[PDB]
Amino acid sequence: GPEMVRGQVFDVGPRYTNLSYIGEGAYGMVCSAYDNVNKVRVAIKKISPFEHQTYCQRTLREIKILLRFRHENIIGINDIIRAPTIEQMKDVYIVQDLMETDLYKLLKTQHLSNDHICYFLYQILRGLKYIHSANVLHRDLKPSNLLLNTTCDLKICDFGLARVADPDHDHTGFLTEYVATRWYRAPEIMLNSKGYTKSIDIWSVGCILAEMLSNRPIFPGKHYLDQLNHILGILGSPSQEDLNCIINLKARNYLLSLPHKNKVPWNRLFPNADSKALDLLDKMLTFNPHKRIEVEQALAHPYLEQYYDPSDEPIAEAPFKPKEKLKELIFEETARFQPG
Numbered sequence: 001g002p003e004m005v006r007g008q009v010f011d012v013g014p015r016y017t018n019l020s021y022i023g024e025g026a027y028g029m030v031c032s033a034y035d036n037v038n039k040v041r042v043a044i045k046k047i048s049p050f051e052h053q054t055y056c057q058r059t060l061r062e063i064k065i066l067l068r069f070r071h072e073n074i075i076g077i078n079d080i081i082r083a084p085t086i087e088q089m090k091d092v093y094i095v096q097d098l099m100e101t102d103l104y105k106l107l108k109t110q111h112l113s114n115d116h117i118c119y120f121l122y123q124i125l126r127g128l129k130y131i132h133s134a135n136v137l138h139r140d141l142k143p144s145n146l147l148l149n150t151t152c153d154l155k156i157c158d159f160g161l162a163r164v165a166d167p168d169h170d171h172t173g174f175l176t177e178y179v180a181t182r183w184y185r186a187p188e189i190m191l192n193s194k195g196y197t198k199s200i201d202i203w204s205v206g207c208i209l210a211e212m213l214s215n216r217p218i219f220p221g222k223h224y225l226d227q228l229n230h231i232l233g234i235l236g237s238p239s240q241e242d243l244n245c246i247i248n249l250k251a252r253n254y255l256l257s258l259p260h261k262n263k264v265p266w267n268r269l270f271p272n273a274d275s276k277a278l279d280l281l282d283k284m285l286t287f288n289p290h291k292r293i294e295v296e297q298a299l300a301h302p303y304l305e306q307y308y309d310p311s312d313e314p315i316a317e318a319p320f321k322p323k324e325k326l327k328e329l330i331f332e333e334t335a336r337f338q339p340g
């Protein structure tokens with residue numbers, strides 16, 4: 001019969017054996033397994049999205065993106081397992097390189113040297129350069145989506161919230177609901193942004209850099225608008241110019257209603273940090289998304305000078321441009337991995 005783990009069919013044999021639980025998500029579970037063809041342990045992500053349109057959409061987007069992308073700092077797909085027919089297919093399993101840990105686990109337990117922070121940040125941005133060069137936004141960058149091997153090589157995972165960039169349709173009203181993880185949300189999400197521009201990811205990287213410096217999330221809000229309280233509590237009140245860029249009256253008037261808040265100096269929050277790291281941090285955690293540093297400028301920043309080499313920071317060859325129909329497309333998209 002099929003192998004099980006945490007009372008849950010893990011139907012991946014005979015190729016993949018000797019399973020141990022790794023982690024989970026909203027509509028599935030990840031295990032490690034032994035690959036009998038390649039003779040190595042691998043990660044296997046079980047996905048069961050077919051009852052929800054939204055989960056089907058996220059599954060399809062993630063599979064399509066990861067199959068197109070090939071980058072050292074981006075998790076790949078080595079294999080996909082599913083039943084031979086639509087009707088026998090209850091689940092999709094994605095086989096990926098097994099990693100030792102993630103940055104979330106590491107930050108709970110380990111002081112990072114400045115050389116580690118520097119190198120981790122370099123790899124994040126190198127992966128993000130490729131992602132953004134493909135006209136794609138990750139939209140949920142956070143420590144638990146950054147995987148590490150035993151020699152600290154880094155891979156970005158979880159493209160379930162990724163979208164093609166759409167900056168001409170980014171505007172929305174004040175307090176519009178948003179799906180991505182709260183602590184890593186850029187201020188404009190809460191004000192007037194759908195999170196359809198590359199600047200949303202730079203903000204999340206800025207939060208990740210801050211968290212590497214102190215082992216604590218920099219903006220740990222407890223609810224939708226508290227997230228913005230935390231941001232402004234450190235950045236201080238927005239400038240007149242930055243306020244004038246927010247044409248939406250509810251968002252503008254909300255900000256104008258708040259008492260003046262002073263900027264907290266980065267070197268007060270992070271008194272042992274490298275001053276170059278804090279200069280890049282400042283640039284990534286800029287309130288105004290138009291003034292926020294872009295990925296290729298971040299890579300070129302003095303903090304990263306030991307690693308910066310644009311000839312070794314590749315870009316994508318081929319950038320990107322109900323529920324029942326979504327299911328057929330997942331069946332189609334996974335066909336190339338089956339026997340026959």
Ligand SMILES: CC(C)Nc1cc(-c2c[nH]c(C(=O)N[C@H](CO)c3cccc(Cl)c3)c2)c(Cl)cn1
Nearest residue numbers: 024025027028029043096098099100101102158
């Ligand atoms: C020991 C660990 C670090 N090794 C490891 C972990 C992963 C991995 C860590 N996370 C994911 C992932 O894709 N997780 C998302 C949730 O973020 C998810 C999982 C299930 C269902 C849904 Cl719908 C979404 C894969 C890899 Cl690929 C290799 N080695």
